[PDB]
Design a protein around this ligand. Sequence first.
Ligand SMILES: O=C(O)CCCC[C@@H]1SC[C@@H]2NC(=O)N[C@@H]21
Ligand SMILES: O=C(O)CCCC[C@@H]1SC[C@@H]2NC(=O)N[C@@H]21
Ligand SMILES: O=C(O)CCCC[C@@H]1SC[C@@H]2NC(=O)N[C@@H]21
Ligand SMILES: O=C(O)CCCC[C@@H]1SC[C@@H]2NC(=O)N[C@@H]21
Lengths: 120, 120, 120, 120
Amino acid sequence: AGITGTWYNQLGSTFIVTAGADGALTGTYESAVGNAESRYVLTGRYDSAPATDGSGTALGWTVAWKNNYRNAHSATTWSGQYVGGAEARINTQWLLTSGTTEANAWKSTLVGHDTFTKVK
Amino acid sequence: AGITGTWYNQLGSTFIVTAGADGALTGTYESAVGNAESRYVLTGRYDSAPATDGSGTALGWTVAWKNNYRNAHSATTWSGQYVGGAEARINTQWLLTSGTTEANAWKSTLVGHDTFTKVK
Amino acid sequence: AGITGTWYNQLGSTFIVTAGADGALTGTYESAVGNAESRYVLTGRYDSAPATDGSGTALGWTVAWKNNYRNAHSATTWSGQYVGGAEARINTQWLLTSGTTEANAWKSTLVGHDTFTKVK
Amino acid sequence: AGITGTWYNQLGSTFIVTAGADGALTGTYESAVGNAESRYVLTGRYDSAPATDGSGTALGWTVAWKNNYRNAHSATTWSGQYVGGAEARINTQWLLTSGTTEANAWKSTLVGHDTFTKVK
Ligand SMILES: O=C(O)CCCC[C@@H]1SC[C@@H]2NC(=O)N[C@@H]21
Ligand SMILES: O=C(O)CCCC[C@@H]1SC[C@@H]2NC(=O)N[C@@H]21
Ligand SMILES: O=C(O)CCCC[C@@H]1SC[C@@H]2NC(=O)N[C@@H]21
Ligand SMILES: O=C(O)CCCC[C@@H]1SC[C@@H]2NC(=O)N[C@@H]21
């Protein structure tokens, strides 16, 4: 109900997710940036029984950057929390790992942050 | 074939994963450490068509720290790569996000690294 | 000139820095949050000869969370870049490491992000 | 005494540091890898009064990747802890930020880990 929907980050990327009663996140990610084109499968987990003390719902998900059209040979993971209310928000940090040789493996992982809203 | 199996990190945690032809990672994670007990659902993605130039296979997965017995109100995501061969290895970095209030949200996310092997 | 001044993050923390011609950052950090009180020494480095193609100036600094009044047994490092202009900005990611036992060393390092402005 | 000396990471990079009574880290970093050549200035902070319960000494430092010969337009920060004894160790996580345009700023920051020893 809270986590299920279409979400928009600060850089124009669309996250369409369903939050299953089991704790399963399933969906699609459409990336407005990077070496990516069009629509990619999303899987993840959330806290299906969160704390009743104004605390956020912990969640996470993975996109492997491969569809029928593109393969970037990379995967992003987002770790974050859902803050429910009027201005509903998913505050995340992410790791983008690229498939490298063992000589290039030191420089394989980019780190960043995304804030997602239900407002396009 | 390569990614499918039972994997062991440096701190004694067991990762039992199946790598589907679609790019789906499904499994269980058993955590030897932290505010955790017993067995937790794992979902993730991998690069199902990796590069043929000695480069690793990009992957990632999520565990929400909630089963039938425990709820830590937290989720870990691992971002990494599979290096195939005799000494087969998953080199990862991870983000552990805890469900917090907006006052505690600065301190919500632990970062670290895990190396997983097929040797117990 | 650009980097030298008083800077304010999103959570009300004050960063007073001098950018030396050698590439040295020296200053004080006053933390509005965490297990901290009052004023702490800052040292760091910046790119003293940045690129002339609209690119930001790479920098970084360290605060050990120990003064004459408090010791949190911890250190934060910020890694980022200075974007110069009318709305002058330091966009950073940070690592906060706490002094732990080898049993607690997995959970020693918090990760986050700060944006600093010259507007209080 | 403990932190003062010559340190060697897993990838052959040399860290020569002095730990001042004030909490100041001063030195040189010689990087065996990346778009770097030869010797670079290091500044940082450590916990000058650590806990007496077998806990590590929190520290951190910055290298801006600019000397008289090279400028990579980038800075690394290491956040970590000193574990003293027979097999003396600095366990770190690091952030490498590159000077980018605001279009490339999502991909500006690499994350990783280094373990440093006093054995070449
Ligand atoms: O460039 C690549 O290697 C593949 C595309 C990566 C897209 C990145 S992942 C972090 C950030 N979140 C997004 O909305 N997309 C970018
Ligand atoms: O303590 C918690 O909040 C829940 C358990 C967390 C387990 C952590 S996640 C990173 C690391 N990988 C493991 O094998 N388990 C620990
Ligand atoms: O709580 C502690 O262990 C010591 C204080 C930490 C202050 C943190 S560091 C990251 C962030 N930046 C700030 O302005 N202060 C907080
Ligand atoms: O390639 C660059 O942009 C400059 C050189 C970076 C060297 C990296 S920083 C992290 C790691 N630690 C080292 O010993 N050097 C590499």
